[PDB]
Design a protein around this nucleic acid. Structure first.
Ligand SMILES: [Mg+2]
Ligand SMILES: [Mg+2]
Ligand SMILES: [Mg+2]
Ligand SMILES: [Mg+2]
Ligand SMILES: [Mg+2]
Ligand SMILES: [Mg+2]
Ligand SMILES: [Mg+2]
Ligand SMILES: [Mg+2]
Ligand SMILES: [Mg+2]
Ligand SMILES: [Mg+2]
Ligand SMILES: [Mg+2]
Ligand SMILES: [Mg+2]
Ligand SMILES: [Mg+2]
Ligand SMILES: [Mg+2]
Ligand SMILES: [Mg+2]
Ligand SMILES: [Mg+2]
Ligand SMILES: [Mg+2]
Ligand SMILES: [Mg+2]
Ligand SMILES: [Mg+2]
Ligand SMILES: [Mg+2]
Ligand SMILES: [Mg+2]
Ligand SMILES: [Mg+2]
Ligand SMILES: [Mg+2]
Ligand SMILES: [Mg+2]
Ligand SMILES: [Mg+2]
Ligand SMILES: [Mg+2]
Ligand SMILES: [Mg+2]
Ligand SMILES: [Mg+2]
Ligand SMILES: [Mg+2]
Ligand SMILES: [Mg+2]
Ligand SMILES: [Mg+2]
Ligand SMILES: [Mg+2]
Ligand SMILES: [Mg+2]
Ligand SMILES: [Mg+2]
Ligand SMILES: [Mg+2]
Ligand SMILES: [Mg+2]
Ligand SMILES: [Mg+2]
Ligand SMILES: [Mg+2]
Ligand SMILES: [Mg+2]
Ligand SMILES: [Mg+2]
Ligand SMILES: [Mg+2]
Ligand SMILES: [Mg+2]
Ligand SMILES: [Mg+2]
Ligand SMILES: [Mg+2]
Ligand SMILES: [Mg+2]
Ligand SMILES: [Mg+2]
Ligand SMILES: [Mg+2]
Ligand SMILES: [Mg+2]
Ligand SMILES: [Mg+2]
Ligand SMILES: [Mg+2]
Ligand SMILES: [Mg+2]
Ligand SMILES: [Mg+2]
Ligand SMILES: [Mg+2]
Ligand SMILES: [Mg+2]
Ligand SMILES: [Mg+2]
Ligand SMILES: [Mg+2]
Ligand SMILES: [Mg+2]
Ligand SMILES: [Mg+2]
Ligand SMILES: [Mg+2]
Ligand SMILES: [Mg+2]
Ligand SMILES: [Mg+2]
Ligand SMILES: [Mg+2]
Ligand SMILES: [Mg+2]
Ligand SMILES: [Mg+2]
Ligand SMILES: [Mg+2]
Ligand SMILES: [Mg+2]
Ligand SMILES: [Mg+2]
Ligand SMILES: [Mg+2]
Ligand SMILES: [Mg+2]
Ligand SMILES: [Mg+2]
Ligand SMILES: [Mg+2]
Ligand SMILES: [Mg+2]
Ligand SMILES: [Mg+2]
Ligand SMILES: [Mg+2]
Ligand SMILES: [Mg+2]
Ligand SMILES: [Mg+2]
Ligand SMILES: [Mg+2]
Ligand SMILES: [Mg+2]
Ligand SMILES: [Mg+2]
Ligand SMILES: [Mg+2]
Ligand SMILES: [Mg+2]
Ligand SMILES: [Mg+2]
Ligand SMILES: [Mg+2]
Ligand SMILES: [Mg+2]
Ligand SMILES: [Mg+2]
Ligand SMILES: [Mg+2]
Ligand SMILES: [Mg+2]
Ligand SMILES: [Mg+2]
Ligand SMILES: [Mg+2]
Ligand SMILES: [Mg+2]
Ligand SMILES: [Mg+2]
Ligand SMILES: [Mg+2]
Ligand SMILES: [Mg+2]
Ligand SMILES: [Mg+2]
Ligand SMILES: [Mg+2]
Ligand SMILES: [Mg+2]
Ligand SMILES: [Mg+2]
Ligand SMILES: [Mg+2]
Ligand SMILES: [Mg+2]
Ligand SMILES: [Mg+2]
Ligand SMILES: [Mg+2]
Ligand SMILES: [Mg+2]
Ligand SMILES: [Mg+2]
Ligand SMILES: [Mg+2]
Ligand SMILES: [Mg+2]
Ligand SMILES: [Mg+2]
Ligand SMILES: [Mg+2]
Ligand SMILES: [Mg+2]
Ligand SMILES: [Mg+2]
Ligand SMILES: [Mg+2]
Ligand SMILES: [Mg+2]
Ligand SMILES: [Mg+2]
Ligand SMILES: [Mg+2]
Ligand SMILES: [Mg+2]
Ligand SMILES: [Mg+2]
Ligand SMILES: [Mg+2]
Ligand SMILES: [Mg+2]
Ligand SMILES: [Mg+2]
Ligand SMILES: [Mg+2]
Ligand SMILES: [Mg+2]
Ligand SMILES: [Mg+2]
Ligand SMILES: [Mg+2]
Ligand SMILES: [Mg+2]
Ligand SMILES: [Mg+2]
Ligand SMILES: [Mg+2]
Ligand SMILES: [Mg+2]
Ligand SMILES: [Mg+2]
Ligand SMILES: [Mg+2]
Ligand SMILES: [Mg+2]
Ligand SMILES: [Mg+2]
Ligand SMILES: [Mg+2]
Ligand SMILES: [Mg+2]
Ligand SMILES: [Mg+2]
Ligand SMILES: [Mg+2]
Ligand SMILES: [Mg+2]
Ligand SMILES: [Mg+2]
Ligand SMILES: [Mg+2]
Length: 68
RNA sequence: CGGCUACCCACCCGACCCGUCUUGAAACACGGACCAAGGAGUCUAACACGUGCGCGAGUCGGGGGCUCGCACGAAAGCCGCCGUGGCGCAAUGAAGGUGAAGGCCGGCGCGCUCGCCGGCCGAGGUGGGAUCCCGAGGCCUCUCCAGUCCGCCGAGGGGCACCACCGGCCCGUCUCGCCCGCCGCGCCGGGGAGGUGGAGCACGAGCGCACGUGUUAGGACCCGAAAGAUGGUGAACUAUGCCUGGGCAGGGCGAAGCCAGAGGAAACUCUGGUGGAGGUCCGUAGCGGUCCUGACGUGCAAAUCGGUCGUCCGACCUGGGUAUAGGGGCGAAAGACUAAUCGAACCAUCUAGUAGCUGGUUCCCUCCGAAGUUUCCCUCAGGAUAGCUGGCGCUCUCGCCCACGCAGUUUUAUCCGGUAAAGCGAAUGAUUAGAGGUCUUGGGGCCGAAACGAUCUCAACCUAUUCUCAAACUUUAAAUGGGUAAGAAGCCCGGCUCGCUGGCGUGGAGCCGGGGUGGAAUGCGAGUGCCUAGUGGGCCACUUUUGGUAAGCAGAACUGGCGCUGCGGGAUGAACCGAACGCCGGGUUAAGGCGCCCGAUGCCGACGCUCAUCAGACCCCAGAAAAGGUGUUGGUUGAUAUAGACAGCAGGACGGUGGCCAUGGAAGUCGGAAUCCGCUAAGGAGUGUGUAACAACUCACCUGCCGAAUCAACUAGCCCUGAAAAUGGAUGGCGCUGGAGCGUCGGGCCCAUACCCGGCCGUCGCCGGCCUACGCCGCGACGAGUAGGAGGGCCGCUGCGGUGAGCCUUGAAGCCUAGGGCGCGGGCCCGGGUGGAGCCGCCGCAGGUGCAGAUCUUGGUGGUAGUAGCAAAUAUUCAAACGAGAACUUUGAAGGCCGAAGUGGAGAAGGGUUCCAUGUGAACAGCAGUUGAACAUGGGUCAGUCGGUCCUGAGAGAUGGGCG
RNA sequence: GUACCCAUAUCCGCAGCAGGUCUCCAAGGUGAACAGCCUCUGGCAUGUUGGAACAAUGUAGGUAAGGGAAGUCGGCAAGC
RNA sequence: CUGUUUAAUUAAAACAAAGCAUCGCGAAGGCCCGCGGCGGGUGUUGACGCGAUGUGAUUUCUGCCCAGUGCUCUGAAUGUCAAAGUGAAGAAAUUCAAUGAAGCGCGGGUAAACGGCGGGAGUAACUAUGACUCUCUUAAGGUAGCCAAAUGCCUCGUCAUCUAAUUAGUGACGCGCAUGAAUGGAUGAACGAGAUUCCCACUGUCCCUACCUACUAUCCAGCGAAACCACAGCCAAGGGAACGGGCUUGGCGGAAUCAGCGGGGAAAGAAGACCCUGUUGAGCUUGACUCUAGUCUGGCACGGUGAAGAGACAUGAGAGG
RNA sequence: CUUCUGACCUUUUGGGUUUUAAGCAGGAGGUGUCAGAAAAGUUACCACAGGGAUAACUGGCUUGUGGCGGCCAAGCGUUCAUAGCGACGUCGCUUUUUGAUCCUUCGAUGUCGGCUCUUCCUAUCAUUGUGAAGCAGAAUUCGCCAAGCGUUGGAUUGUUCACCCACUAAUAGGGAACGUGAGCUGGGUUUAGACCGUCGUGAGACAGGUUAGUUUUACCCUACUGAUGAUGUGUUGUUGCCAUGGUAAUCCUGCUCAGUACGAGAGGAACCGCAGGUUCAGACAUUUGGUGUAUGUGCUUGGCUGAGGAGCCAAUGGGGCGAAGCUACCAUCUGUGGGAUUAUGACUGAACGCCUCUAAGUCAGAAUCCCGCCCAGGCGGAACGAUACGGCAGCGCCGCGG
């Protein structure tokens, strides 16, 4: 009652029935896995960007609109 | 005259019998004699998904109540202070419990890696994002002027659905830190900043109804078992006890006891009768069954018969009553018997037990369409998961110098490898041979008391070489192959934030604003979500390989095919070569072929090879080698020949020297070593034959005649030998030799469902029109397919509600039909005939809804087939009679059998009118009948003294009592 | 209760089935015998069919010149 | 020995048998039945009886081992050993400690209980064979007997006899794979429908077949089924699921039949009795797992009165190293 | 599930305290069949559902192995390789042994051997014709054409195989599903009974040994043997051909040749001719032997017809003979030759001045082959005869018109 054990015949033809797909697109890539000390940098940097970017960038926009 | 047609026949070509298990079916695999009816995926509950409807942060009366007593009303209508309740709107924790809003501006405490007060907005931001809005500008018969008008658009803005990321809030644990409050200051509560797990929030989409698919539990697609339990029925067969009865022909052997006689001293012994003993011998009835493995062996019989048998006074055979009843009984023990069943009886119930295991599974058309593979399982005939597949969609993109993106592809750059190869005078492992050198010990020899005092030889070592390799060696290193990049998600500039880092505004990440998109080739319109069947036994072929001697063997890699697949060649074929399939007309071709089958060379085809007394005839493919050929055709290497060869004829073939090693010979001639000179025309210290040797013969060599080409060794094309198998046979056969064989080719010719054009059907994509919009057109590309999945059916059957002022006793359903027709098809309509009372079309609804199979169930009917068979036991014959009718009925007569253990006269059990008479002969008696045990009618059984009734036998049994 | 069968045709075996089922009575001859054979009383039509011929093969019975087990696993069967 | 046995494949070398023995039991008992009772069989019985066993007449015999598995007896002398009871800790549940019935072990017996019975080397005036002797080892080491047997793989062992010829028979030899003593050994008159070899007579078993009779088979009168059947039946070769009838290429092929014969139809009769698979069973067996009837014990109630003796705990006094 | 560790943790159900219990998080106790059930054996008394997914027969591929050939030749063969052989190597054939695979067969293909019977192959044992020897003759050995015909009786074993005796020209090798069981036999293998020896505690097992152990059916089709018949010639009869199918003859002994050739002897032929004999085939019964129911004759046993005579029955009562018929290698007769040729030996004669059996031509040439002889004669054809009264008929030749 010996049977055929293992083969990879008729496998690439099944693979190319659907055109094997790259993930091909991740705009603004996934962030998990990166260094937790770098995350402790980046989250506080982002929320203080939300806090204190207003007036200096506003005056810089006024200055660059006056210059050009 | 015309007619396709379920009519019949002939002709050319193709054509194995369907269904399934299978890699493979026409199979020497299985089911199927034929026909009619029935026959197999239903229903409930639960879940999930998709679709349609109503209401919608709600939804639902399914539970009851209200109406007057209504056939349809077991319907329907309503409740609302009947919403109790289910699901959802809130999750997280094991739990105590806790529980989803933030952002902007101004002020203060040292705007402190830090909390508070006042006002405003309100489910955040980034990049995409259908759509929408604004708009420079352009364009409509001659000028200024205009309003709607014809009319797009660079660029800009707000940004649904969803995608990707960041940030925020809730709960539980973890880390670090400070503050607040007091119906009471405590091992009391709450709050902050980070990293976490959750099926969460971040403007909610559910509930109910119905349909479709899938899964699960239920008998559950249909049929199927060996088995288990529960409760009853059997000792009329058989097994064994017990009671009660019955039976067993004749002979042979001759025990105990008894009588008489004889011998002896006694003890005692011997002889002739008599007697009838015995789990005794031959043998009958009876009981069993050894052998012929006889006859049957669809028989007389689901165990019998004929011979030959064993035993037959007994451990003998047997009737009736009774007792032992199923995991029990009984067993002179065979697991044998227990009602044709016994290694656990029979009947019913659980039960339609379960089966991963055989078989079957019912209308058509269209579209798409596999796999025998990964992993896991007490897994290997199975299942789960992933892959392959189908269906349902959603998000976008195009139609009006440039788009988003993708690829079994190439190129341009960039890396990666360790196989093929090659090498080992390169590491490792093997392995061959020679040379040189002198350090060293081991064995021989010389100078010689001995001495590395000197030297010859040998071994090992070293040096430079050289021979051959290595899947588990490698300096080097291919071809093929794999990854990445070829832009707006990319560059450049300027600036903020950081609690990361730190000489530094140093670096790095994030955030904000702006500038220019023409950045390899070719082709293609893309992304994404849900549900699910089948599959999980494979095989073959080129190339690379593992094991094996090899296999149509077993196991791997890439690709293709079969499976799942037709068609043209290979005669015949699963895989080979072409080439893939809707129905046809024309033309062309591939693979192949052109002597006849058999379409096409029947060309004044070309070149050359081949004789077989076993020719040869085209990948897989259906047979063959080493070796050999003065059989022929080329080719290479050479050597001879006018200073006349090759073959032919003729002549010579000596001297030293009978040399040397030998003596059984050698005086060239078995053998061992050699090898010259003279005469020369030339002789080889001799190529062979012999006479044992001594001698004759012959050859190399030489010369006379002849006359110009000759000889040798290899090589490869055809052919031959090598080449032997059983049924008679295979280039397919027939035949084929100036080819119809072989190798090279030229021009034509033939066709497949292949290709091009055209007609028709269908599917798909795009689209047209304000003509059943679910209809009507238009263009273009394609149609194959088992398992499986969808869509359509104005295919069909049954019944239900609407509906056709439907149909008809002037003929409905059903059935038959060499008739007419439609649709590709499921099927349908009409014509003709039997028939006599119900039937149909459309729209919705619900099925016990379609048959070729299942050793399918029931019923009927063929071939066999007027066949086998009416043959165990000796046998009938003549005349007459009743009678339509006599081999069979009856009588006379003749001949036989049973022959007293009967083929006779009567009984017990069992049968129940079969007993008797009359009448009929369809029915039964396996032919027949006037006959019978058949049929119909009418009769027949008389008891104090025959038996039961009475009695107990083995035993069965109730009360008293005990147990339950 | 009293008929009848009590059986190769009235029972059982699916049947007018070479199967099975318990008993009494028993003649003459030959013969030891209730053995086998032929007769008597008493029954019967040969056992679910008849006619014609006598082929192969078969089923039962009998023989065969000479050898006597040489055949066959075995003297199996048959015969003394 | 006579007898019995697998009805429907065995008739025996199988079973039974008398004889030989063994064990349990003196009745409140042995062996058993029963769901139950002091219910029943043995038992209308009492060791010359009942029940369970091995072997199987007569003669001669009954070798040696209790190491193992069994069976039995004994001592609370001593380890282990469950309920119930005693004491201590605590508020109690609970925990701990000693006390220790059966059984196991410790000790003895038993083999006419289950069973078992050795392999090495050197040795005698030719060679061999080899009593004797050394050594490992067990519990004992096969004794009296017997043999290529119904028991011997090699093996058709060797020798002798029967025959012309023998894998057959008979007799002997015996380190005998793997004979053997109630697992009974060795003989053994009579009897085997038991198995085998040889001899005389006898015959068709044959050489070597032939003939005759009865019945059937043949035909006719009457009456007449059954199995089986996808279709139906001419062969050779090739291919194919590797042996076809139907495919291909050849050989070819006349209607309808009768009597036979068995080459074929991989003929029919049965869902292979052989092999394997099933997470399918069933008879069994035991030192497989898990239970239980029965049975041996301890405790608790029925279960009560009197005396004597002993053990342990607690109290006080005296001796004691 | 158990155990341990940690929080001054949660719940211990109406409220508090304590013990206990449960939970939370992580370490261990283990699933070796290692992603994990807790598990001995037998069934020859076996059963069920399946499988040729999977063995035991054949058949199919291969030929390791077996068997049978070839190649070069160191040597054996007194000398001498190839008369006969041939070491070491090497190339092949076959499925007559065995092995390998599982392709078919599990809803069955009846599995060994023997008997009987038919056909085929040659790798030839003998016979016919041949060549070569270390072939003097005789007897052998090696090859070729060659399968036409033969290739025994027996003691043993179930035997296949194997050994032995005797005869003979010789006792050659095989195939046909390891030919053949709806042909037989059942001897063993291979059911159930049982015994011995070994293993196992035991049920039981033993390619260890010995006994007893059911062999079912043809009437279907085809094939084959035999017998009717069918088609066209108008019917029918007689006399005849053979196209085709088959094939039949084989072998040995004795006498002359001849005690001759040959050989020193020992020994010892051949050709023709003559008597025969073995096997096979066809017959036939005059004789012989069988059979015998002309139930023919004649005895005799037991019974029966009253006794004699005549008889009858006893499954043809017995046996003595026995006519006709069937039969026996148990009696007797018969079995027949022409051609082309294979192997081989040659002639003439080149290639290649010569040689040569060959390349074209020729000759001889055998159990091989074909034909004759002999069997049945074709969907084959001939020649000839009669060819339908009766009282009306009916039927043929010539030439006819519709
Ligand atoms: Mg597989
Ligand atoms: Mg398939
Ligand atoms: Mg198969
Ligand atoms: Mg098929
Ligand atoms: Mg079959
Ligand atoms: Mg079939
Ligand atoms: Mg069938
Ligand atoms: Mg139907
Ligand atoms: Mg929904
Ligand atoms: Mg509520
Ligand atoms: Mg059970
Ligand atoms: Mg019961
Ligand atoms: Mg009785
Ligand atoms: Mg008995
Ligand atoms: Mg007696
Ligand atoms: Mg006697
Ligand atoms: Mg006797
Ligand atoms: Mg009997
Ligand atoms: Mg009998
Ligand atoms: Mg018989
Ligand atoms: Mg018969
Ligand atoms: Mg008798
Ligand atoms: Mg007798
Ligand atoms: Mg007797
Ligand atoms: Mg027995
Ligand atoms: Mg038994
Ligand atoms: Mg029975
Ligand atoms: Mg059983
Ligand atoms: Mg039972
Ligand atoms: Mg069912
Ligand atoms: Mg069932
Ligand atoms: Mg698996
Ligand atoms: Mg299957
Ligand atoms: Mg799946
Ligand atoms: Mg999809
Ligand atoms: Mg799709
Ligand atoms: Mg290499
Ligand atoms: Mg499905
Ligand atoms: Mg393979
Ligand atoms: Mg294909
Ligand atoms: Mg495909
Ligand atoms: Mg073709
Ligand atoms: Mg071909
Ligand atoms: Mg065309
Ligand atoms: Mg071509
Ligand atoms: Mg043509
Ligand atoms: Mg040549
Ligand atoms: Mg050749
Ligand atoms: Mg030919
Ligand atoms: Mg050519
Ligand atoms: Mg299609
Ligand atoms: Mg009516
Ligand atoms: Mg209709
Ligand atoms: Mg139905
Ligand atoms: Mg209905
Ligand atoms: Mg039907
Ligand atoms: Mg079907
Ligand atoms: Mg049927
Ligand atoms: Mg029927
Ligand atoms: Mg009816
Ligand atoms: Mg019929
Ligand atoms: Mg008849
Ligand atoms: Mg009869
Ligand atoms: Mg009359
Ligand atoms: Mg009259
Ligand atoms: Mg009669
Ligand atoms: Mg009588
Ligand atoms: Mg009557
Ligand atoms: Mg009748
Ligand atoms: Mg009458
Ligand atoms: Mg009546
Ligand atoms: Mg009176
Ligand atoms: Mg009375
Ligand atoms: Mg009672
Ligand atoms: Mg009472
Ligand atoms: Mg009476
Ligand atoms: Mg009777
Ligand atoms: Mg009778
Ligand atoms: Mg008398
Ligand atoms: Mg007398
Ligand atoms: Mg009497
Ligand atoms: Mg009768
Ligand atoms: Mg005789
Ligand atoms: Mg005689
Ligand atoms: Mg004699
Ligand atoms: Mg004799
Ligand atoms: Mg014999
Ligand atoms: Mg006899
Ligand atoms: Mg006689
Ligand atoms: Mg018997
Ligand atoms: Mg005795
Ligand atoms: Mg007692
Ligand atoms: Mg003893
Ligand atoms: Mg002891
Ligand atoms: Mg000595
Ligand atoms: Mg001894
Ligand atoms: Mg003998
Ligand atoms: Mg022994
Ligand atoms: Mg012993
Ligand atoms: Mg014919
Ligand atoms: Mg054929
Ligand atoms: Mg093939
Ligand atoms: Mg074949
Ligand atoms: Mg064939
Ligand atoms: Mg067939
Ligand atoms: Mg045909
Ligand atoms: Mg075909
Ligand atoms: Mg016939
Ligand atoms: Mg027959
Ligand atoms: Mg059969
Ligand atoms: Mg089966
Ligand atoms: Mg399994
Ligand atoms: Mg079991
Ligand atoms: Mg596992
Ligand atoms: Mg047996
Ligand atoms: Mg070989
Ligand atoms: Mg197979
Ligand atoms: Mg096989
Ligand atoms: Mg395979
Ligand atoms: Mg057969
Ligand atoms: Mg022949
Ligand atoms: Mg065979
Ligand atoms: Mg036998
Ligand atoms: Mg036997
Ligand atoms: Mg034992
Ligand atoms: Mg017997
Ligand atoms: Mg007949
Ligand atoms: Mg002829
Ligand atoms: Mg003859
Ligand atoms: Mg005579
Ligand atoms: Mg007389
Ligand atoms: Mg007289
Ligand atoms: Mg008489
Ligand atoms: Mg008589
Ligand atoms: Mg007579
Ligand atoms: Mg006579
Ligand atoms: Mg010649």
């Amino acid at each position: 009652a010996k049977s055929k054990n293992h083969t990879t015949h008729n496998q690439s033809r099944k693979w190319h029935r659907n055109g094997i797909k790259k993930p091909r697109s991740q705009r603004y890539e996934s962030l998990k896995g990166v260094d937790p000390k770098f995350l402790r940098n980046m989250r506080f940097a982002k929320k203080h960007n939300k806090k204190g970017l207003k007036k200096m960038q506003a005056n810089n926009a006024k200055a660059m609109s006056a210059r050009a």
